[PDB]
Design a protein around this ligand. Structure first.
Ligand SMILES: O=c1[nH]cc([C@@H]2O[C@H](CO)[C@@H](O)[C@H]2O)c(=O)[nH]1
Ligand SMILES: O=c1[nH]cc([C@@H]2O[C@H](CO)[C@@H](O)[C@H]2O)c(=O)[nH]1
Lengths: 300, 298
């Protein structure tokens, strides 16, 4: 089939260092593919979609390895950028539960409007576009201004990076904030479940088509500007690794949209994807598939 | 058609610098590391045909470590890619160093069986450099099968050096720092007054040549045949101390292979160390005979 999805976002090398026996201590150090956009792209390939990553890595060899590893999970990485003389962005975590974390993502800024415009007609012929908020405001504005009626799904990434979305909700098809992100955007505290209707009305008054609000233990509240809303309860999971849960949920939303699925069922399915990510030791679960998510959901 | 063989570990060093002081912005640098791998790179840069015998895992980042190493001149074609293992790494949080993690278990994949599959190739090298990251069995194998090829040994750390203690009579040149020499000999190196005694210990235990680096005090060198002396440090603007010992070791082995006398080899080696010290990286990209000679003649 000649249908594809375009993901525009960041590709990181995650580095986790675990202390044992808590100067130079022995321990375990794991390099993994990371970055919200790259992760999403990988989950979409595993969900069986033709996925193209538009992203940036540097010439530091390890950048090329990141791309290669990503390509092997199914992702089309050929249009990605290899920036001369820059380092490949990275997310470093010192664990024991995370003690300290460093965030080195300046190369995100190389994902420019000029870069994207050189692939304009290719982006405009995608079935859906997914964008994360690691990219600059100019680059996100470019995507939203040139989507040519292709739905743009936006992953807000963090309370800090989500704000670039506030003035452009009327250009985003589906937004998936967590509690802190939705509070930051709307300026309305999400104290309890009682507050979500008000926060959702805020998002829709500001032009957002569809809100997928994840509220942790409280579940997911979903709301469509056309009137449909509801709560979906969490899928009980024994959680091994929370990293990648949101990336899984975003991938499942977009895949379900492209597959022709209704909103409420797409949200439940997305929750299942997330659940698969949660019970896996990795940022992405290699066993994520329509089959297994369907099996995980129907058994509930 | 002459070459040098280096047997040791190949790491990815990761330096994370906390910037403004949770998820903190900062800088994270991935670089090639590992004593053996570093030495091999310095030897290629000094113009020698250098072959690395080492182990990396199948984690893609391993393959690129090899590729980057190769790009610096090193023949990486005989290295091991261990299925379903991770590439060893040295993680550092820095500003001075706060914490550092050491993940080097793949070192154990550099086995006696592995080396024996390249036995005749190792036995035709001009010199063999081995680091003490490898297991005691693997180091014993090298020393037992060097077939009269000189083995230069980098002791790596006070912890890892001890595997050398019972086999000094098989090692051509050993390059310990103060702490390593103290750990091996059991003789404290309190002041300069102690080196003669430490050196006599090493020679009574069969070591051919000692190159003892004493930090600020310089380098003390001693040959079992009688020659010994102090060489004063090369006054350097130190930017990055990582890699200084690896440059010094490379320079010793290169100078030996080049036919140089001991004392001149030590001065030259110090110059290499100096180039490494004044550089931002674990290896200086500008390391060369030309530049070391030019640095030394002053
Ligand atoms: O600011 C950011 N921090 C962390 C990530 C990545 O989130 C992944 C989990 O969702 C994780 O891989 C990290 O690299 C990002 O893309 N932007
Ligand atoms: O036990 C060890 N710690 C650190 C290193 C490496 O030393 C390099 C500097 O000499 C540095 O690259 C590290 O990887 C090693 O090989 N073994």
């Amino acid at each position: 089939e000649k249908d594809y999805v375009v993901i525009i976002g960041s590709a990181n090398i995650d580095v986790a260092g675990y202390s044992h026996e808590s100067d130079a201590n022995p321990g375990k150090i794991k390099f993994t593919p990371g970055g919200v956009g790259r992760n999403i792209a990988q989950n979409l390939a595993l969900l069986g979609n033709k996925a193209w990553l538009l992203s940036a890595v540097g010439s530091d060899f390890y950048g090329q390895s990141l791309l290669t590893q990503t390509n092997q999970s199914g992702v089309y990485v050929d249009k990605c950028l290899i920036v001369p003389g820059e380092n490949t962005s990275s997310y470093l975590s010192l664990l024991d539960e995370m003690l300290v974390a460093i965030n080195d993502m300046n190369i995100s800024n190389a994902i420019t409007a000029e870069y994207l415009a050189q692939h304009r007609e290719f982006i405009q012929r995608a079935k859906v576009i997914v964008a994360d908020c690691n990219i600059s405001e100019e680059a996100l504005a470019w995507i939203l201004d040139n989507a040519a009626n292709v739905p743009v799904f936006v992953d807000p990434v963090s309370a800090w990076k989500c704000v670039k979305v506030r003035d452009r909700l009327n250009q985003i098809h589906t937004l998936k904030p967590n509690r802190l992100e939705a509070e930051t955007l709307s300026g309305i505290a999400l104290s309890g479940r009682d507050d979500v209707a008000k926060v959702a009305a805020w998002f829709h008054q500001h032009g957002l088509n569809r809100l997928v609000l994840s509220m942790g233990g409280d579940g997911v509240y979903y709301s469509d500007i056309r009137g449909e809303n509801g709560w979906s309860a969490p899928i009980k999971t024994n959680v091994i690794n929370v990293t990648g849960a949101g990336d899984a949920m975003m991938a499942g939303l977009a895949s379900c949209w492209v597959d022709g699925m209704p909103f409420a069922e797409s949200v439940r399915f997305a929750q299942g994807c997330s659940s698969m990510a949660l019970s896996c030791e990795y940022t992405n679960n290699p066993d994520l598939s329509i089959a297994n998510v369907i099996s995980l959901v129907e058994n509930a």
